[PDB]
Amino acid sequence: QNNNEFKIGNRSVGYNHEPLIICEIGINHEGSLKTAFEMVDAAYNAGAEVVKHQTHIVEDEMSDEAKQVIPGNADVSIYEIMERCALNEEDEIKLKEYVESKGMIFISTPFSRAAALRLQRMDIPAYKIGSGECNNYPLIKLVASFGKPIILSTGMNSIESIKKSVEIIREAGVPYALLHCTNIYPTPYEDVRLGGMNDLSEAFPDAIIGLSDHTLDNYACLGAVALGGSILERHFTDRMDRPGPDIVCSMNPDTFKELKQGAHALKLARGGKKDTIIAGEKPTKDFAFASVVADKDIKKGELLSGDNLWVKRPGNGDFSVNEYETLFGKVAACNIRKGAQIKKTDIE
Amino acid sequence: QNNNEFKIGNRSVGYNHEPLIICEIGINHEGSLKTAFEMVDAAYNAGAEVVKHQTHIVEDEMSDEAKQVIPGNADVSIYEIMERCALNEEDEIKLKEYVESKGMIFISTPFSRAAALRLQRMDIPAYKIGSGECNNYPLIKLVASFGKPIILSTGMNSIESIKKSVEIIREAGVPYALLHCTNIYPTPYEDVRLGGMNDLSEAFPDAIIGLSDHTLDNYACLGAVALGGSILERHFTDRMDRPGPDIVCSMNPDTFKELKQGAHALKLARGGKKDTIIAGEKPTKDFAFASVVADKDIKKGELLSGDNLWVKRPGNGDFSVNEYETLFGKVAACNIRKGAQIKKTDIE
Numbered sequence: 168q169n170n171n172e173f174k175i176g177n178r179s180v181g182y183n184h185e186p187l188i189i190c191e192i193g194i195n196h197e198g199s200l201k202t203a204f205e206m207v208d209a210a211y212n213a214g215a216e217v218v219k220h221q222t223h224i225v226e227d228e229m230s231d232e233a234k235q236v237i238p239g240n241a242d243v244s245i246y247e248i249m250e251r252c253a254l255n256e257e258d259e260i261k262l263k264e265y266v267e268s269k270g271m272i273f274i275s276t277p278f279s280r281a282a283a284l285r286l287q288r289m290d291i292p293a294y295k296i297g298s299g300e301c302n303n304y305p306l307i308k309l310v311a312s313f314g315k316p317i318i319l320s321t322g323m324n325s326i327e328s329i330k331k332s333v334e335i336i337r338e339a340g341v342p343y344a345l346l347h348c349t350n351i352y353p354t355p356y357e358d359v360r361l362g363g364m365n366d367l368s369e370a371f372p373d374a375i376i377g378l379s380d381h382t383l384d385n386y387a388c389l390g391a392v393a394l395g396g397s398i399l400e401r402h403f404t405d406r407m408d409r410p411g412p413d414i415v416c417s418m419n420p421d422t423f424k425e426l427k428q429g430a431h432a433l434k435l436a437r438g439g440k441k442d443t444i445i446a447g448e449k450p451t452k453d454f455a456f457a458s459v460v461a462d463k464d465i466k467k468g469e470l471l472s473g474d475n476l477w478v479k480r481p482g483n484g485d486f487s488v489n490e491y492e493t494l495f496g497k498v499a500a501c502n503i504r505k506g507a508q509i510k511k512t513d514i515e
Numbered sequence: 516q517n518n519n520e521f522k523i524g525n526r527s528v529g530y531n532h533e534p535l536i537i538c539e540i541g542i543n544h545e546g547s548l549k550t551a552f553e554m555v556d557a558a559y560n561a562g563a564e565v566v567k568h569q570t571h572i573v574e575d576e577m578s579d580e581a582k583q584v585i586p587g588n589a590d591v592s593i594y595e596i597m598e599r600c601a602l603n604e605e606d607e608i609k610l611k612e613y614v615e616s617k618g619m620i621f622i623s624t625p626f627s628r629a630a631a632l633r634l635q636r637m638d639i640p641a642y643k644i645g646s647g648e649c650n651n652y653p654l655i656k657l658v659a660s661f662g663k664p665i666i667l668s669t670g671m672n673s674i675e676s677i678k679k680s681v682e683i684i685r686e687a688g689v690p691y692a693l694l695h696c697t698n699i700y701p702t703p704y705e706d707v708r709l710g711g712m713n714d715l716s717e718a719f720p721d722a723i724i725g726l727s728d729h730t731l732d733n734y735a736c737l738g739a740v741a742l743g744g745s746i747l748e749r750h751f752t753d754r755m756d757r758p759g760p761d762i763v764c765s766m767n768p769d770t771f772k773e774l775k776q777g778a779h780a781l782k783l784a785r786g787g788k789k790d791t792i793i794a795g796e797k798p799t800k801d802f803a804f805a806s807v808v809a810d811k812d813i814k815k816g817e818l819l820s821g822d823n824l825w826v827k828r829p830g831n832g833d834f835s836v837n838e839y840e841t842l843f844g845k846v847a848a849c850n851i852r853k854g855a856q857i858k859k860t861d862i863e
């Protein structure tokens with residue numbers, strides 16, 4: 168598709184690089200640092216390159232009205248969920264060091280101004296902005312002024328609303344990625360609309376394109392890689408029997424490994440051009456292509472025609488099936504045996 | 516992508532229909548009708564809709580030169596392989612009835628004029644033309660005059676060489692499909708070039724598009740579905756420990772089931788548009804979007820500014836984050852408490 172790219176630390180991202188899978192532990196640790204470490208361990212052992220957290224500072228993230236609104240995948244207020252799962256600054260700093268001590272990249276999604284400022288102090292290599300904040304222009308202006316690349320999910324937002332955020336990002340001069348997304352825990356296959364990735368790349372040609380996903384399996388993400396996706400995102404848990412509203416659509420070590428393997432295979436198979444010559448096909452072309460042969464015993468002097476000529480494998484004959492009709496009208500320079508390949512010396 | 520379509524018997528094929536998986540037993544039965552039936556049974560029990568055979572009449576398919584050429588995946592001449600695996604007319608008729616007795620569709624790839632005529636007598640619902648015969652124009656003219664839809668693989672052929680075959684097909688007035696393909700047993704991921712499907716659809720807008728595959732797994736085909744493929748083809752065997760040159764890249768009942776499941780999921784997830792409104796996202800939009808709030812206690816009379824205003828979740832406030840800046844300059848109609856959502860009655 169394109170040659171756009173940028174780096175998250177020492178990791179290059181873009182169409183011409185290996186797709187990057189972001190393992191979002193998010194709020195899956197339910198506020199326990201111990202659980203968070205067990206999930207970081209599972210990600211590390213599964214071969215993850217990036218672990219993504221969610222930075223929640225409830226007071227700066229939402230007003231009192233949030234204590235009265237229930238999310239689609241929960242039974243209590245969003246305020247109660249975030250307050251229950253939120254890690255204080257101290258613990259989050261410990262989580263970042265822990266992930267890095269494992270040789271992995273740590274990034275986190277900020278949901279507020281205070282969160283963004285905390286992450287800037289921690290000096291993360293890139294900032295993720297969720298679909299909920301894709302239209303929070305003032306917050307995006309703040310994050311872009313940090314000087315690091317931005318990864319923006321675009322669920323729940325139209326191309327036009329997104330253009331305002333991208334304009335702000337360009338103005339700041341930092342590279343960015345746009346992840347197509349559908350924000351429903353979980354998301355049915357029918358609502359995915361992988362075509363959205365194309366719409367985004369067409370509208371924003373300088374953007375790295377990817378997919379953030381909330382379906383129950385790897386199919387959507389694998390399709391995203393086939394279409395040209397460079398960044399894949401799925402919630403991640405060490406085991407499926409963990410409690411939590413996001414566990415339902417989370418991938419686990421086993422499913423992460425499958426996704427990584429499939430993404431690699433599709434990275435290799437995607438794109439390319441129809442007319443490209445594949446050397447490995449040579450031996451097949453040599454025996455599978457047809458050559459012109461006598462379909463009847465032809466006496467010297469007789470004229471060749473579509474009545475006494477036909478075509479058969481292999482393709483080493485003097486005349487290819489492509490020249491079949493050009494032999495019509497020619498005269499046999501000698502007797503031609505039925506079934507024999509017509510050779511140049513066979514025509515006067 | 517498009518609304519092109521046609522029927523293979525009572526089965527509709529096209530972008531707006533469920534992708535069709537063709538199970539190619541081909542020469543996997545090694546010339547044994549008993550083995551062929553065991554493979555047909557395995558396909559049936561796995562849920563296959565179509566079983567594809569290969570019709571070999573060695574004398575009309577190749578000249579004596581073929582007894583001296585070895586294919587890439589074999590150690591003996593192509594003539595010896597075909598002669599060893601070929602089913603006579605009697606047995607092939609029995610195979611067709613057997614497949615149909617199982618409620619499945621039977622089609623077969625012809626490799627010669629004699630093969631095409633035999634299949635016409637059997638009256639198959641559609642004709643498959645392999646990549647080896649994609650450039651065999653005289654043979655294609657013969658098959659097109661039969662009046663049934665044609666499925667043409669295009670491996671080893673450039674867009675220009677393919678246009679000659681398509682012209683012949685249109686001239687005959689029958690619907691057709693173009694399958695991208697790479698003819699190497701097996702095919703590495705890197706040689707797949709899924710982009711070839713796009714090239715084909717762009718060049719031939721009236722063609723149903725699909726993929727014929729020879730890789731070691733389902734990844735290539737799943738990627739093809741994500742891109743818009745309507746027909747998938749893989750060699751098929753009842754078990755992987757069967758002898759034969761094509762068994763290496765064949766799928767088996769278990770892998771067929773996985774492909775069918777994935778193709779279904781990707782049929783649902785592919786395409787669509789970014790701007791489409793997903794009803795299921797409503798509850799998320801209501802709590803995730805931000806509203807304007809007082810960032811400072813504002814005394815009546817004071818002017819609102821980016822210094823004493825900010826934005827926070829949820830999205831039920833009188834002023835959305837989109838209107839943040841429009842409040843700059845307004846005058847507080849009364850005292851505004853820090854953290855409170857700015858309401859219409861809050862400004863004079």
Ligand SMILES: [Mn+2]
Binds near residue numbers: 380381402
């Ligand atoms: Mn998510």
Ligand SMILES: [Mn+2]
Binds near residue numbers: 728
């Ligand atoms: Mn094949």
